[PDB]
Amino acid sequence: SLALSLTADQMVSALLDAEPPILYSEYDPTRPFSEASMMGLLTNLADRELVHMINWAKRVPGFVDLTLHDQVHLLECAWLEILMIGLVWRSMEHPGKLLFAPNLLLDRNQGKCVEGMVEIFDMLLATSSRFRMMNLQGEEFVCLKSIILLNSGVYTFKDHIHRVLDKITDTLIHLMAKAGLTLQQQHQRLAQLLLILSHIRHMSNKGMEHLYSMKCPLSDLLLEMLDAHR
């Protein structure tokens, strides 16, 4: 695997370069929000984002060295976490709001338009506020998102993955050391960031639970992504 031979800087650059584009919503301001149209907008957005997530995964150093089925497994496990950490990241500069797309910025009040979504909404807003108060850098964000990809499904099927995870850890520490943070601040910040991944996992689970409940529109790709969590 060529991913282990990489330096910290070229690990960062490889991840920044791999970053997916910000997509736009079909959002229509002349029409108001119903529960169905809101979930329709979010589903359509997520479905398109997923296609780019797959291109991004292939460019995550070490991911292509995996078995195709191992790649499938990791993505099936982590896809909603990855969307969520993306949503949280681009919502940092909009306190109290969630930037699903540049033309789709929503507050928690609009989260009430669909039954119960305000709960996972407040959780996301909290994570965003957490990142903002931490001054989460983009270089750190890309590391966190790659970690989620490789870690989330690593215990559901390995040594290579853990070695890449170690590598990404080295990269995170390298980023913090460059920012001037002391050795104590380095491990503390590292811990703070990784603990947030536990909350992202929780949010994904709650969200996933709801998603395979309203299967009782959704694209065929999502239906397969969702079925993997059953």
Binding site: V51, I54, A57, K58, L68, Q71, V72, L75, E76, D220, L221, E224, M225
Partner: peptide, 10 residues
């Protein structure tokens, strides 16, 4: 198979 299979190869 899966759609995700095809997307990963392409």
């Amino acid at each position: 198979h899966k759609i995700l299979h095809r997307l990963l190869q392409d």
